[PDB]
Amino acid sequence: DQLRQEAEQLKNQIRDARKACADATLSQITNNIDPVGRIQMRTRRTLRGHLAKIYAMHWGTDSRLLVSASQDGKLIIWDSYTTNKVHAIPLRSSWVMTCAYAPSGNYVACGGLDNICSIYNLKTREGNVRVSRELAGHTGYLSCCRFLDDNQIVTSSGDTTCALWDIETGQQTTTFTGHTGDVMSLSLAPDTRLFVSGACDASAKLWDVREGMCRQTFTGHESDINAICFFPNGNAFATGSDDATCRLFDLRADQELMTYSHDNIICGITSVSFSKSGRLLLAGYDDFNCNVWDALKADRAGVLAGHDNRVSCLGVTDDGMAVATGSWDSFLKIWN
Amino acid sequence: LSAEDKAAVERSKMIDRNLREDGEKAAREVKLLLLGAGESGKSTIVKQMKITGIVETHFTFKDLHFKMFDVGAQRSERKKWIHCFEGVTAIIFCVALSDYDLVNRMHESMKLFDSICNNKWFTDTSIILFLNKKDLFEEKIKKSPLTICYPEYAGSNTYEEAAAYIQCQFEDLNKRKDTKEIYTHFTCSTDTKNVQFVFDAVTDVIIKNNLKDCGLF
Amino acid sequence: AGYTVLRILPLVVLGVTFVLGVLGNGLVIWVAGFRMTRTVTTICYLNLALADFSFTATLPFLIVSMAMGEKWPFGWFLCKLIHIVVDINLFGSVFLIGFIALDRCICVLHPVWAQNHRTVSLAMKVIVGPWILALVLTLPVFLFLTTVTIPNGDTYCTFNFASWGGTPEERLKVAITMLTARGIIRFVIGFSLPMSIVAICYGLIAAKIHKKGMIKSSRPLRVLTAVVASFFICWFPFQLVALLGTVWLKEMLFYGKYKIIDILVNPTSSLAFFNSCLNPMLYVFVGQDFRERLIHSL
Amino acid sequence: VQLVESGGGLVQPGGSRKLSCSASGFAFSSFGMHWVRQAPEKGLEWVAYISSGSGTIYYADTVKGRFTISRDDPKNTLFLQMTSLRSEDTAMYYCVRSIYYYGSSPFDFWGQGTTLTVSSDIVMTQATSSVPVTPGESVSISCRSSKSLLHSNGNTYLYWFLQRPGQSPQLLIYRMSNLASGVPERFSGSGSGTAFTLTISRLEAEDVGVYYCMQHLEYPLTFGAGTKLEL
Amino acid sequence: IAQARKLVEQLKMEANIDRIKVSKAAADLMAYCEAHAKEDPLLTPVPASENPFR
Ligand SMILES: CC(C)c1c(NC(=O)Nc2ccc(Cl)cc2)c(=O)n(-c2ccccc2)n1C
């Protein structure tokens, strides 16, 4: 306990350092901007293929193809424009909690309770989708996997550690230790040199992909963080937690900027995404309705109540055209 | 209009028929979640049913396909992945009877049982409780007393009464006696009668589920 | 005389049957057919609902006919369309109730077989067997039923065999034979096949749950006895009045000995249409899963 | 991926023959398959097609009724049953695979072919038939479509094939804009619904051959007369 | 006990951050939002002829 004391000293120093910077809250600065409150989006498409709970969905960089992960053991790539199914991948493990779509579009990744991030090659000389390589160095369930390139994927796990992988070799080049709880989500920076992680210790950590160490730690929340997403600028991010609160943290200021919580909401947040300009915060909820938040004024500008079951995943296209929400009712909807 | 988007739709409808045929094939198998805190007979019973991460086990008995998921090699927060098993037909929970005096270890089994039995994800999910190592329990109970696990135990130190006491202390941990049933069995090296017990419990659960789908229940 | 209320209560119950059956069958068709996952039970309930929703929809043209002394005002198309829908939908209601009984019995007596071989695709393939049998059993209405004009100026929808016979005795001989057919099929296919199947199948799943001790409330026995008796209380009086009228078919026509049966045909038939009113309440509303979709999607 | 045709030979005019396509190295059941024949010293003509799953079958108007196309997915083979054969059915029949989904490259792989020696349409016209070129020049092959190939979905259904001397055709540009896997970036495609262009930048010795257009907007799929480059 | 020696090291590294005041850090998020508000399709209902979804 000799050096446990200096941990409180450094915590007080950091708290004072970020207290001094908090001269004016974001809410005061946004008392002049025009509010948006008429955000009403309607279900343009309903993807009906899955026969079980949908745990993860990921949009393609083309804003048209999306990959969907469900517990029927199927990974489905959808044509959001025509509702068509491009591919239906049979997974070895049906307990998949995450799915990523490669920015190039040539691969999809799938992980879950099998502790393996499986890479699937979508574009082969044959016509089938084949397992490119199974990444099996994690000890807990994989909660999130995000592609940095065709050869680099960063995965979060229930082993409390995030890992950076080299796909063609299959070895985790860099491991990211420092959390004390199961890491539940990942969000790559737009430049793909940083990433934030949200774990069950109610803390978010900013990591350096190249360096391998965490530069910042954010601990506004009270319960475990289930969702994390960077602001489109890359300088901020928003976290969703079982606390029923969404927070906004700014890396440069290094603290919480705004809190998105309402009294009518007791359920936690399963997924968080930002609009293309970052003005809207799309958060998934266990009340069966997604909630659009004015990210600058922290007001509920809209509700997406089209799901009869808990929303688990939601994502916005790179074009910003539509927001897709997946839910445990087995249905994935595209909202515009 | 559709030029070759007419053939993408044909593919989208050909890989939508396989999803139905895989969902029909996957919904005809009983899904069992195998649990148990620390050292128990779960590894032992998995041998009795004729088969890191989830150890999925397949076995068929009396034309009924089973799919057992062992989550033992998963050290994480159960709250973050226990909801993945919400639609299991039944939970198989293994408790080692010989752990009453060990390290205390029997009380940990009760904490794990209470956490899952009253879990909001399993309110109707029945539990097949396996009180394993009944042979070691009877050998040990003559010398070591059950008082070392339960201070408030008013009874004799014999196997057939203390075992019933253990079954009562585990079967009274549920607060949902109306909506779900616990099937308890004592097993040490049972000659393939554990599969019979699981089959009977699963058949009762399937019948009760078929009644709930109808209005009879 | 005292035989005046008998001209009223059949009209009152059928209007009540029309409104309640339309509302309940529409609610079940919408909730089960659109707001619920397709299951073997849901498909059977939706098919049973379709039969007694269309039958209730075609009820008011039998209400106005009965109100006007069985005279048929509508055209020859409707008499040869509204009585085709009633015979197909009424014989389809009884064969879907039997099918639901058989499925409920198989799901309890052989749960392992019902786990490995009971699929939505197989249910859809087999759910049309009752529908084809109802279609085959309505051919006497397709061919022999038409509107007939009386010199007084009244048109009645009835089975006319003038074209089929071509001779006054020969028309009667085909008329008696074909009427005895759709009378006897009406009892053996309409009541003795569905009622026996319902009694045996629900009796078997009351002995099974009792032998295995699954009664934790009086709701199982109450729902089972309701689905068994309600089919008997509604369907039996009509099928007995009709079987009597078919066993004594010649006496009613040539001598008119039993006019009590003819005046009982309208109340008993109304009671047997009220089963279409009770079917959604007894089979789909009892389920908590269905109720938790009506209020969760209201 | 290998597509091997068999069943070719000399037939008296009026007889019957069955062509086989032994397909190995790829998921045959997931690929729609085509038969494209080439009359000797002449251009490509599409004759038949089976969708994946066998649900959709189309035939050329010339062979419709007397030609039958079937596949056996477990046996990984494609069959063309030919009856009422005439003198103008003598051609090298190519077996072509095509997979249809968003972003796919249909007609990607062509079989070797087999020779028979029997003793409205979206007309596609190549303006030229021979083009003298040097190994350093940049030829721009032209193509003309009778009906506009641009669709409401935004895709222009024009494919570019290169058939080297004594070889099967290879897809270079599918949907007129993006080049097929395995093709050098020198090839490029452009066009505006009609009047399409295939631009080659550094014409190597392996670019010499006959270039064929094909429309995939409507069946039957019509090919161009073919533009040849001589070295 | 290495947990304390590493946790204090991480806290020291996190302390050495050139933090920016929230006012400039908050006004730089609304600067990005207005600079891309026009190109945000979810913020406003775009005409049906420019929306890929019906
Ligand atoms: C409903 C009206 C149109 C009706 C008949 N038509 C049917 O009763 N159709 C039918 C289909 C299936 C089943 Cl299970 C039971 C009945 C019928 O015979 N009537 C009758 C006529 C004379 C004597 C007795 C009854 N009346 C009045």
Side-chain angles (χ1 to χ4, degrees), chain C residues 72-136:
Chain C
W72 193 260
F74 317 92
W76 167 93
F77 184 61
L78 275 66
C79 69
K80 208 182 269 286
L81 168 79
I82 294 169
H83 291 303
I84 295 169
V85 160
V86 159
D87 285 37
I88 284 170
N89 295 266
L90 268 194
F91 261 127
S93 179
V94 315
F95 293 156
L96 289 166
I97 280 172
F99 187 97
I100 291 167
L102 270 166
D103 182 47
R104 286 197 185 160
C105 186
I106 298 181
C107 296
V108 169
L109 263 71
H110 314 140
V112 179
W113 186 97
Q115 173 97 326
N116 299 317
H117 305 117
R118 178 182 182 269
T119 52
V120 159
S121 64
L122 183 90
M124 302 204 104
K125 293 181 177 66
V126 187
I127 212 69
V128 295
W131 278 118
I132 302 299
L133 186 50
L135 191 62
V136 180

Coordinates of all heavy atoms in Angstrom, one line a residue, chain C residues 72-136:
Chain C
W72 N -84.5 -15.0 -50.8 CA -83.2 -14.5 -51.2 C -83.4 -13.3 -52.1 O -83.7 -13.4 -53.2 CB -82.4 -15.6 -51.9 CG -81.0 -15.3 -52.1 CD1 -80.4 -14.8 -53.2 CD2 -79.9 -15.4 -51.1 NE1 -79.1 -14.6 -53.0 CE2 -78.7 -15.0 -51.7 CE3 -79.9 -15.8 -49.8 CZ2 -77.5 -15.0 -51.1 CZ3 -78.7 -15.8 -49.1 CH2 -77.5 -15.4 -49.8
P73 N -83.1 -12.1 -51.6 CA -83.2 -10.9 -52.4 C -82.0 -10.8 -53.5 O -82.3 -10.4 -54.6 CB -83.2 -9.7 -51.5 CG -82.5 -10.2 -50.3 CD -82.8 -11.7 -50.2
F74 N -80.9 -11.2 -53.1 CA -79.6 -10.9 -53.9 C -79.7 -11.7 -55.2 O -80.6 -12.6 -55.4 CB -78.4 -11.2 -53.1 CG -78.4 -10.7 -51.7 CD1 -78.9 -11.5 -50.6 CD2 -78.0 -9.4 -51.4 CE1 -78.9 -11.0 -49.4 CE2 -78.0 -8.9 -50.1 CZ -78.5 -9.7 -49.1
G75 N -78.7 -11.5 -56.0 CA -78.7 -12.1 -57.3 C -78.3 -13.6 -57.3 O -78.1 -14.1 -56.3
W76 N -78.4 -14.2 -58.5 CA -78.0 -15.6 -58.6 C -76.5 -15.8 -58.3 O -76.2 -16.9 -57.9 CB -78.4 -16.1 -60.0 CG -77.8 -17.4 -60.4 CD1 -78.4 -18.6 -60.2 CD2 -76.6 -17.7 -60.9 NE1 -77.6 -19.6 -60.6 CE2 -76.4 -19.1 -61.1 CE3 -75.5 -16.9 -61.3 CZ2 -75.3 -19.7 -61.7 CZ3 -74.4 -17.4 -61.9 CH2 -74.3 -18.8 -62.0
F77 N -75.7 -14.8 -58.6 CA -74.3 -15.0 -58.3 C -74.0 -15.1 -56.8 O -73.3 -16.0 -56.4 CB -73.5 -13.8 -58.8 CG -72.0 -14.0 -58.7 CD1 -71.3 -15.0 -59.3 CD2 -71.3 -13.1 -57.9 CE1 -70.0 -15.2 -59.1 CE2 -69.9 -13.2 -57.7 CZ -69.3 -14.3 -58.3
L78 N -74.6 -14.2 -56.0 CA -74.4 -14.2 -54.5 C -74.9 -15.5 -53.9 O -74.3 -16.1 -53.1 CB -75.0 -13.0 -53.9 CG -74.1 -11.7 -53.9 CD1 -73.9 -11.3 -55.4 CD2 -74.7 -10.6 -53.1
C79 N -76.1 -16.0 -54.3 CA -76.7 -17.2 -53.7 C -75.7 -18.4 -54.1 O -75.5 -19.2 -53.2 CB -78.1 -17.5 -54.2 SG -78.2 -17.9 -55.9
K80 N -75.2 -18.3 -55.2 CA -74.1 -19.3 -55.6 C -72.8 -18.8 -55.3 O -71.8 -19.2 -56.0 CB -74.3 -19.7 -57.1 CG -73.8 -21.1 -57.4 CD -73.9 -21.5 -58.9 CE -75.2 -22.1 -59.2 NZ -75.3 -23.5 -58.7
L81 N -72.6 -17.8 -54.4 CA -71.3 -17.4 -53.9 C -71.3 -17.4 -52.4 O -70.4 -17.8 -51.8 CB -70.8 -16.1 -54.5 CG -69.6 -15.5 -53.8 CD1 -68.3 -16.2 -54.3 CD2 -69.5 -14.0 -54.0
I82 N -72.4 -16.9 -51.8 CA -72.4 -16.7 -50.3 C -72.7 -18.1 -49.7 O -72.3 -18.3 -48.6 CB -73.5 -15.7 -50.0 CG1 -73.2 -14.3 -50.5 CG2 -73.9 -15.7 -48.5 CD1 -74.3 -13.3 -50.4
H83 N -73.3 -19.0 -50.4 CA -73.6 -20.3 -49.8 C -72.4 -21.2 -50.1 O -72.2 -22.2 -49.5 CB -74.9 -20.9 -50.2 CG -76.1 -20.2 -49.5 ND1 -76.1 -20.0 -48.1 CD2 -77.1 -19.5 -50.0 CE1 -77.2 -19.4 -47.8 NE2 -77.9 -19.0 -48.9
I84 N -71.6 -20.9 -51.1 CA -70.3 -21.6 -51.4 C -69.3 -21.3 -50.3 O -68.7 -22.2 -49.8 CB -69.7 -21.4 -52.8 CG1 -70.7 -21.9 -53.8 CG2 -68.3 -21.9 -52.9 CD1 -70.4 -21.5 -55.2
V85 N -69.2 -20.0 -49.9 CA -68.3 -19.5 -48.8 C -68.7 -20.1 -47.5 O -67.8 -20.5 -46.8 CB -68.2 -18.0 -48.8 CG1 -67.7 -17.4 -47.5 CG2 -67.4 -17.5 -50.0
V86 N -70.0 -20.1 -47.2 CA -70.5 -20.7 -45.9 C -70.2 -22.2 -45.8 O -69.6 -22.6 -44.9 CB -72.0 -20.5 -45.7 CG1 -72.7 -21.4 -44.7 CG2 -72.3 -19.0 -45.3
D87 N -70.4 -23.0 -46.9 CA -70.2 -24.5 -46.8 C -68.7 -24.7 -46.8 O -68.3 -25.6 -46.0 CB -70.9 -25.2 -47.9 CG -72.4 -25.4 -47.7 OD1 -73.0 -24.4 -47.1 OD2 -73.0 -26.4 -48.0
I88 N -67.9 -24.0 -47.5 CA -66.4 -24.2 -47.5 C -65.9 -23.8 -46.2 O -65.1 -24.5 -45.6 CB -65.7 -23.5 -48.7 CG1 -65.9 -24.2 -50.1 CG2 -64.2 -23.3 -48.4 CD1 -65.5 -23.4 -51.2
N89 N -66.3 -22.6 -45.7 CA -65.7 -22.0 -44.5 C -66.2 -22.8 -43.2 O -65.5 -22.9 -42.3 CB -65.7 -20.5 -44.5 CG -64.7 -20.0 -45.5 OD1 -63.6 -19.7 -45.2 ND2 -65.2 -19.8 -46.7
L90 N -67.4 -23.3 -43.2 CA -68.0 -24.0 -42.1 C -67.4 -25.4 -41.9 O -67.3 -25.8 -40.8 CB -69.5 -24.1 -42.1 CG -70.3 -22.9 -41.5 CD1 -71.8 -23.3 -41.4 CD2 -69.7 -22.6 -40.2
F91 N -67.2 -26.0 -43.1 CA -66.6 -27.4 -43.1 C -65.1 -27.3 -42.9 O -64.5 -28.2 -42.6 CB -66.7 -28.1 -44.4 CG -67.9 -29.1 -44.6 CD1 -68.7 -29.0 -45.7 CD2 -68.0 -30.1 -43.7 CE1 -69.8 -29.9 -45.9 CE2 -69.1 -31.0 -43.9 CZ -69.9 -30.9 -45.0
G92 N -64.6 -26.1 -43.0 CA -63.2 -25.8 -42.9 C -62.9 -25.5 -41.5 O -61.8 -25.8 -41.1
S93 N -63.8 -24.8 -40.9 CA -63.7 -24.5 -39.4 C -63.7 -25.8 -38.6 O -62.8 -26.0 -37.8 CB -64.8 -23.6 -39.0 OG -64.7 -23.4 -37.6
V94 N -64.6 -26.8 -38.9 CA -64.6 -28.1 -38.2 C -63.4 -28.9 -38.5 O -63.0 -29.7 -37.6 CB -65.9 -28.8 -38.5 CG1 -67.1 -27.9 -38.4 CG2 -65.9 -29.6 -39.8
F95 N -62.7 -28.8 -39.6 CA -61.6 -29.7 -40.0 C -60.3 -29.0 -39.5 O -59.3 -29.7 -39.3 CB -61.6 -29.9 -41.5 CG -62.7 -30.6 -42.1 CD1 -63.1 -30.4 -43.4 CD2 -63.4 -31.6 -41.3 CE1 -64.2 -31.1 -43.9 CE2 -64.5 -32.2 -41.9 CZ -64.9 -32.0 -43.2
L96 N -60.3 -27.7 -39.4 CA -59.1 -27.0 -38.7 C -59.2 -27.2 -37.2 O -58.1 -27.3 -36.6 CB -59.1 -25.6 -39.2 CG -58.6 -25.4 -40.6 CD1 -58.9 -24.0 -41.1 CD2 -57.2 -25.7 -40.8
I97 N -60.3 -27.2 -36.6 CA -60.4 -27.5 -35.2 C -60.0 -28.9 -34.9 O -59.2 -29.2 -34.0 CB -61.9 -27.3 -34.7 CG1 -62.2 -25.8 -34.4 CG2 -62.2 -28.1 -33.4 CD1 -63.6 -25.5 -34.2
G98 N -60.3 -29.9 -35.8 CA -59.8 -31.2 -35.7 C -58.3 -31.3 -35.8 O -57.6 -32.0 -35.2
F99 N -57.8 -30.6 -36.8 CA -56.3 -30.5 -37.1 C -55.6 -29.9 -35.9 O -54.5 -30.4 -35.6 CB -56.1 -29.7 -38.4 CG -54.7 -29.8 -38.8 CD1 -54.3 -30.7 -39.8 CD2 -53.7 -28.9 -38.3 CE1 -53.0 -30.7 -40.2 CE2 -52.4 -28.9 -38.7 CZ -52.0 -29.8 -39.7
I100 N -56.1 -28.8 -35.3 CA -55.5 -28.2 -34.1 C -55.5 -29.2 -33.0 O -54.5 -29.3 -32.3 CB -56.2 -26.9 -33.8 CG1 -55.9 -25.8 -34.8 CG2 -55.8 -26.4 -32.4 CD1 -56.8 -24.6 -34.7
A101 N -56.6 -29.9 -32.8 CA -56.6 -31.0 -31.8 C -55.6 -32.0 -32.0 O -54.9 -32.4 -31.1 CB -58.0 -31.6 -31.7
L102 N -55.4 -32.5 -33.3 CA -54.5 -33.5 -33.6 C -53.1 -33.0 -33.4 O -52.2 -33.8 -32.8 CB -54.6 -34.0 -35.0 CG -55.6 -35.1 -35.3 CD1 -55.9 -35.2 -36.8 CD2 -55.0 -36.4 -34.8
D103 N -52.8 -31.8 -33.8 CA -51.4 -31.2 -33.5 C -51.2 -31.0 -32.1 O -50.1 -31.4 -31.6 CB -51.3 -29.9 -34.2 CG -50.0 -29.2 -34.1 OD1 -49.0 -29.9 -34.3 OD2 -49.9 -28.0 -33.8
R104 N -52.1 -30.6 -31.3 CA -51.9 -30.4 -29.8 C -51.7 -31.7 -29.2 O -51.0 -31.8 -28.2 CB -53.1 -29.7 -29.2 CG -53.2 -28.2 -29.5 CD -54.1 -27.5 -28.6 NE -54.3 -26.1 -28.9 CZ -55.3 -25.3 -28.5 NH1 -56.3 -25.8 -27.8 NH2 -55.4 -24.1 -28.9
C105 N -52.4 -32.8 -29.7 CA -52.2 -34.1 -29.1 C -50.9 -34.7 -29.5 O -50.3 -35.4 -28.6 CB -53.3 -35.0 -29.6 SG -53.4 -36.7 -28.9
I106 N -50.4 -34.5 -30.7 CA -49.1 -35.0 -31.1 C -48.0 -34.3 -30.4 O -46.9 -34.9 -30.1 CB -48.9 -35.0 -32.6 CG1 -50.0 -35.9 -33.3 CG2 -47.5 -35.4 -33.1 CD1 -49.9 -35.9 -34.8
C107 N -48.1 -33.0 -30.1 CA -47.1 -32.2 -29.4 C -47.0 -32.7 -27.9 O -46.0 -32.2 -27.3 CB -47.4 -30.8 -29.5 SG -47.3 -30.1 -31.2
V108 N -48.0 -33.4 -27.4 CA -48.0 -33.8 -26.0 C -47.7 -35.3 -25.8 O -47.0 -35.7 -24.9 CB -49.3 -33.4 -25.3 CG1 -49.4 -34.0 -23.9 CG2 -49.4 -31.9 -25.2
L109 N -48.3 -36.1 -26.7 CA -48.1 -37.6 -26.6 C -46.8 -38.0 -27.2 O -46.2 -39.0 -26.6 CB -49.3 -38.2 -27.2 CG -50.4 -38.6 -26.3 CD1 -51.2 -37.4 -25.8 CD2 -51.4 -39.6 -27.0
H110 N -46.4 -37.4 -28.3 CA -45.1 -37.8 -28.9 C -44.2 -36.5 -29.0 O -44.1 -36.0 -30.1 CB -45.2 -38.5 -30.2 CG -46.2 -39.6 -30.2 ND1 -47.1 -39.8 -31.2 CD2 -46.5 -40.5 -29.3 CE1 -47.9 -40.8 -30.9 NE2 -47.5 -41.3 -29.7
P111 N -43.8 -35.9 -27.9 CA -43.0 -34.6 -28.0 C -41.7 -34.7 -28.8 O -41.3 -33.8 -29.3 CB -42.9 -34.2 -26.6 CG -42.8 -35.5 -25.8 CD -43.8 -36.4 -26.5
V112 N -41.1 -35.9 -28.7 CA -39.8 -36.1 -29.5 C -40.1 -36.2 -31.0 O -39.4 -35.6 -31.7 CB -39.2 -37.4 -29.0 CG1 -37.9 -37.7 -29.8 CG2 -38.9 -37.4 -27.5
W113 N -41.2 -36.8 -31.4 CA -41.6 -36.9 -32.8 C -42.0 -35.5 -33.2 O -41.6 -35.0 -34.3 CB -42.7 -37.8 -33.1 CG -43.0 -38.0 -34.5 CD1 -42.6 -39.0 -35.4 CD2 -43.9 -37.1 -35.3 NE1 -43.1 -38.8 -36.6 CE2 -43.9 -37.7 -36.6 CE3 -44.6 -36.0 -35.0 CZ2 -44.6 -37.1 -37.7 CZ3 -45.3 -35.4 -36.1 CH2 -45.3 -35.9 -37.4
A114 N -42.7 -34.8 -32.4 CA -43.2 -33.4 -32.7 C -42.0 -32.4 -32.7 O -42.2 -31.3 -33.0 CB -44.3 -33.0 -31.8
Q115 N -40.9 -32.8 -32.2 CA -39.7 -31.9 -32.1 C -38.9 -32.1 -33.4 O -38.3 -31.1 -33.9 CB -38.8 -32.2 -30.9 CG -37.5 -31.5 -30.9 CD -37.6 -30.3 -30.0 OE1 -38.6 -29.6 -30.0 NE2 -36.5 -30.0 -29.4
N116 N -38.8 -33.3 -34.0 CA -37.9 -33.6 -35.1 C -38.7 -33.5 -36.4 O -38.0 -33.4 -37.5 CB -37.3 -35.0 -34.9 CG -36.5 -35.1 -33.7 OD1 -35.7 -34.2 -33.4 ND2 -36.6 -36.2 -33.0
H117 N -40.0 -33.5 -36.5 CA -40.7 -33.6 -37.7 C -41.8 -32.5 -37.9 O -42.6 -32.6 -38.9 CB -41.3 -35.0 -38.0 CG -40.2 -36.1 -37.9 ND1 -40.2 -37.0 -37.0 CD2 -39.1 -36.3 -38.7 CE1 -39.2 -37.8 -37.1 NE2 -38.5 -37.4 -38.2
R118 N -42.0 -31.7 -36.9 CA -43.1 -30.7 -36.9 C -42.5 -29.3 -37.3 O -42.0 -28.6 -36.4 CB -43.8 -30.7 -35.6 CG -45.0 -29.7 -35.5 CD -45.5 -29.8 -34.1 NE -46.6 -28.9 -33.9 CZ -46.6 -27.7 -33.4 NH1 -45.4 -27.2 -33.1 NH2 -47.6 -26.9 -33.2
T119 N -42.6 -29.0 -38.6 CA -42.0 -27.7 -39.1 C -43.1 -26.8 -39.7 O -44.2 -27.2 -39.8 CB -40.9 -28.0 -40.1 OG1 -41.5 -28.9 -41.1 CG2 -39.7 -28.7 -39.6
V120 N -42.7 -25.6 -39.9 CA -43.7 -24.6 -40.6 C -44.0 -25.1 -42.0 O -45.1 -25.0 -42.4 CB -43.1 -23.2 -40.5 CG1 -43.7 -22.3 -41.5 CG2 -43.2 -22.6 -39.1
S121 N -43.0 -25.5 -42.7 CA -43.2 -25.9 -44.1 C -44.1 -27.1 -44.2 O -45.1 -27.2 -45.0 CB -41.9 -26.2 -44.8 OG -41.2 -27.3 -44.2
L122 N -43.9 -28.1 -43.3 CA -44.8 -29.3 -43.3 C -46.2 -28.9 -42.8 O -47.2 -29.4 -43.4 CB -44.3 -30.4 -42.3 CG -45.1 -31.7 -42.3 CD1 -44.6 -32.6 -43.4 CD2 -45.0 -32.3 -40.9
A123 N -46.3 -27.9 -41.9 CA -47.7 -27.4 -41.5 C -48.4 -26.8 -42.6 O -49.6 -27.1 -42.8 CB -47.5 -26.5 -40.4
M124 N -47.7 -26.0 -43.4 CA -48.3 -25.3 -44.6 C -48.7 -26.4 -45.6 O -49.8 -26.3 -46.2 CB -47.4 -24.3 -45.2 CG -47.0 -23.2 -44.2 SD -46.4 -21.7 -45.0 CE -47.9 -20.6 -44.7
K125 N -47.9 -27.4 -45.8 CA -48.3 -28.5 -46.8 C -49.5 -29.2 -46.3 O -50.3 -29.6 -47.2 CB -47.1 -29.4 -47.0 CG -45.9 -28.8 -47.6 CD -44.7 -29.8 -47.8 CE -43.5 -29.2 -48.5 NZ -42.9 -28.1 -47.7
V126 N -49.6 -29.5 -45.0 CA -50.7 -30.3 -44.5 C -52.0 -29.5 -44.2 O -53.1 -30.0 -44.2 CB -50.3 -31.2 -43.3 CG1 -51.3 -32.1 -42.9 CG2 -49.0 -31.9 -43.7
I127 N -51.8 -28.2 -43.9 CA -52.9 -27.3 -43.5 C -53.9 -27.1 -44.7 O -55.0 -26.7 -44.4 CB -52.5 -25.9 -43.0 CG1 -53.4 -25.4 -42.0 CG2 -52.3 -25.0 -44.2 CD1 -53.3 -26.2 -40.7
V128 N -53.6 -27.4 -45.9 CA -54.5 -27.3 -47.0 C -55.3 -28.6 -47.3 O -56.3 -28.6 -48.0 CB -53.7 -26.9 -48.3 CG1 -53.1 -25.5 -48.2 CG2 -52.7 -28.0 -48.7
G129 N -54.9 -29.7 -46.6 CA -55.7 -30.9 -46.7 C -57.1 -30.7 -46.2 O -58.1 -31.2 -46.9
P130 N -57.3 -30.1 -45.0 CA -58.7 -29.7 -44.6 C -59.3 -28.8 -45.6 O -60.5 -28.9 -45.8 CB -58.4 -29.1 -43.3 CG -57.2 -29.8 -42.7 CD -56.4 -30.0 -43.9
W131 N -58.6 -27.9 -46.2 CA -59.1 -26.9 -47.1 C -59.6 -27.5 -48.4 O -60.6 -27.1 -49.0 CB -58.1 -25.8 -47.4 CG -58.1 -24.7 -46.3 CD1 -57.1 -24.4 -45.5 CD2 -59.2 -23.9 -45.9 NE1 -57.5 -23.4 -44.6 CE2 -58.8 -23.0 -44.9 CE3 -60.5 -23.7 -46.4 CZ2 -59.6 -22.1 -44.3 CZ3 -61.3 -22.8 -45.8 CH2 -60.9 -21.9 -44.8
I132 N -58.8 -28.5 -48.9 CA -59.3 -29.3 -50.1 C -60.5 -30.1 -49.8 O -61.4 -30.2 -50.6 CB -58.1 -30.1 -50.7 CG1 -56.9 -29.2 -51.0 CG2 -58.6 -30.9 -51.9 CD1 -57.2 -28.2 -52.1
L133 N -60.5 -30.8 -48.6 CA -61.6 -31.6 -48.2 C -62.9 -30.7 -48.1 O -64.0 -31.2 -48.4 CB -61.3 -32.3 -46.9 CG -62.3 -33.3 -46.5 CD1 -62.7 -34.3 -47.6 CD2 -61.8 -34.1 -45.3
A134 N -62.7 -29.5 -47.6 CA -63.9 -28.6 -47.5 C -64.3 -28.2 -48.9 O -65.5 -28.1 -49.1 CB -63.5 -27.4 -46.7
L135 N -63.4 -28.0 -49.8 CA -63.8 -27.7 -51.2 C -64.5 -28.8 -51.9 O -65.5 -28.6 -52.5 CB -62.5 -27.3 -52.0 CG -62.6 -26.7 -53.4 CD1 -63.3 -25.4 -53.3 CD2 -61.2 -26.5 -54.0
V136 N -64.0 -30.1 -51.7 CA -64.7 -31.2 -52.3 C -66.0 -31.4 -51.8 O -66.9 -31.9 -52.5 CB -63.8 -32.5 -52.2 CG1 -64.4 -33.7 -52.8 CG2 -62.4 -32.3 -52.8

